[model samples]
Target: PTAKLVRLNPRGGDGPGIVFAPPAGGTVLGYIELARHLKGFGEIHGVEAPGLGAGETPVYPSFEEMVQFCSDSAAGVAGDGVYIGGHALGGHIAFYLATMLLDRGIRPKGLIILDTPPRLIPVADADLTEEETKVFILAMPYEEAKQLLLDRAKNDPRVSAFLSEDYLDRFLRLQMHQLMYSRDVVLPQRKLDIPIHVFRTKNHAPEVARLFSAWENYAAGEVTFVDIPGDHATMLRAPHVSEVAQLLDRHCGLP
Candidate 1:
């Protein structure tokens, strides 16, 4: 399976862990910043999907296969109990992951869903800029703006300075699968039966918040919305991720 677990905070304190899923077609690297802030709160173990890394690997054919492919790896790390979280599609995976855990008697404490709408929002196609990789990926999904760089990374000096070009094609292949498979998902009719903590970005557009209330119907338990800094795109970026970590600690009541 291309999906496996990576410990986000290797040097983190002995706090309870969170089994975090990465956004669709994305890598665990996306959560590195937030994990740094959360080192004291708990270990953030992220799921690394295939194709997003340095080596070439096959992408998951469907979202269902991808989730179950990831379930065993998640269970290994979170068998005792843990918080589940992810950004966007990763949030969907986290929600479903809780269900899988519940079935295996693992029972995640709650879901820390970061800026995921109950409805899928299509990314408007656009131009790309190679100068800034961070802003490029800020679309909340790794599509659109930064995409040009994905293909041209090998020869682009700016990109070559950081990324490994060997498997860059994986991003191209996996993201399409992500978009196709992603559109089909919704909160299970069966309900998660767990608290759903939806983090609303403080700087978002009004339309950005429209569907947040929708997640309420999917949770058999409480659904709480928190306003944290940054728009959905920048929530996991610097400065804002700190507040995210703090809020997580407060919510988790970590000692």
Candidate 2:
């Protein structure tokens, strides 16, 4: 499928300064809101991942295809000094893009990761029997899945107060299946070298903390660690969101 992109500019602003890369399967809208908020500092843009939001379905079958697709998308949308990063899967996507670009002899000024880790951390340490995995799936909140789908069609203000209407549907698509896949997907064995700012979710599983600790050690570039004071989903919609916004402002050197 041909990939479709959504571009949101500052309500009344200037030239393309920086473009943020979306997580795998993230919508351009969510990043738009983030970019706009960051615009207080500088011009910012976002790219919709293929098969998420208003973009094309996955052209590449495996995760590597998705990574290449992201590099291509970044090349296309972020012309001339585009700095890209994202939340969760989006952050993971940025990691992949940087790695591929490095292999191809391209380099980004900087990269960021949010509420994500390098590798998949199983929910449990014990070997999972087929029944356990199935049970786990069953225990999964089906409503969250449906809510993700419905939000795309119509973003409920109650559910997404900070988010603009432009982001409703696509955000839903991104947070659902695609984002889930992004979290679990892995690339062929290769270590990536990109500076990362990993925002840790306080509500994450203990294993997540351990895994993130390991990632912090070998991050391709400088690594900064932070704790976001909310559950995985609430971190996006929670009050005091300014804390995160402020952090991004300072770290990304927006203004």
Candidate 3:
């Protein structure tokens, strides 16, 4: 069965809004905290990608498959002028969907990328082999992984309550899924032409910033870039969450 759709309205009534596409390996509920604050602006719809949230396990692999899933899913809910944004892998999926939509005669007014890097951290020349790649992915400590997911759930009462009991196990399964998928998949596709607004962290060096800026040329439409206050990862989690949301409204033209 399909997972129940996840949508949040901050204001008591309805108004213009956009869909919040979640990062890879995360549930739509992950964005509930920010959505609550966004209610004053417009209703926030958290679109759940298949397998990542309550939806069924992915039926097909690769970025292309995921893009199709998100576009088709959004088509069902988006009214006249719907907006779209995403975090990390979800951001990547959002760009892919935009490109695909244009290919098929659909065009979104804007694109929001929260902390998603323009380029994949390429496999170093010395570490080109599959075994080396797998080792690189597993190098992070288990406790650090737990903190990553927990940090996202901290301000979220619903997810925080859910994690209080099984975060360790859930975090592990999420990583395990990443480990398994990494062994066989290389996300080869690149971004399409569109107007992009990226909210990256301050810690990103000028070189990384240049790399991201260069990516703007790839889109069919014009692209605009912006930098946020902290490191890339903090854009979604608390302390910086509201700041990031405010940036979304300002730069993304969230209407």
* lDDT for each candidate structure: 0.69, 0.55, 0.56
Q: How many backbone clashes does candidate 2 have?
A: 5
Name the runs in model 3 displaced over 4 angstroms.
1-4, 10-16, 39-41, 52-60, 120-161, 164-193, 205-207
* Count of clashing pairs, candidate 3: 4
User: Stretches of candidate 1 above 4 Å error?
Assistant: 1-3, 11-15, 53-56, 119-158
lDDT per residue for candidate 1 within 224-249, as digits (tens), equals 89878876666777778889878776
Candidate 1 whole-model C-alpha lDDT, 0 to 1 = 0.69
Clashing pairs in 2: 23-89, 23-90, 51-56, 152-169, 193-220
**Clashing residue pairs, backbone N/CA/C < 3 A, model 3:** 10-39, 11-39, 193-219, 193-220
Q: Which model, 2 or 3, shows the larger TM-score?
A: 3
Instruction: Encode model 3's per-residue lDDT on 1-255: one tens digit a residue.
Output: 124346665433244466666564545655776666553245567666454432344332455555666667666554445567777666766666666656656666667777656534222223134543454356426556545544544656775666533433443355445333432224334556556777777666566555666656556566767667655555556887787767666665434
**Lowest lDDT block of 10, candidate 3:** 119-128
How far residue 156's Cα lies from its native spot in candidate 1, in Å, is 8.8
| Residues 85-163, model 2: lDDT tens digits | 6665566667667776666666666666667676552233133445434533443256664453454334446556664
The candidates, ranked best first by lDDT, are 1, 3, 2
Top TM-score model: 1
Instruction: Give candidates' CA RMSD values in order.
Output: 4.8, 6.7, 6.8
- The deviation in Å at residue 141 for candidate 2 is 14
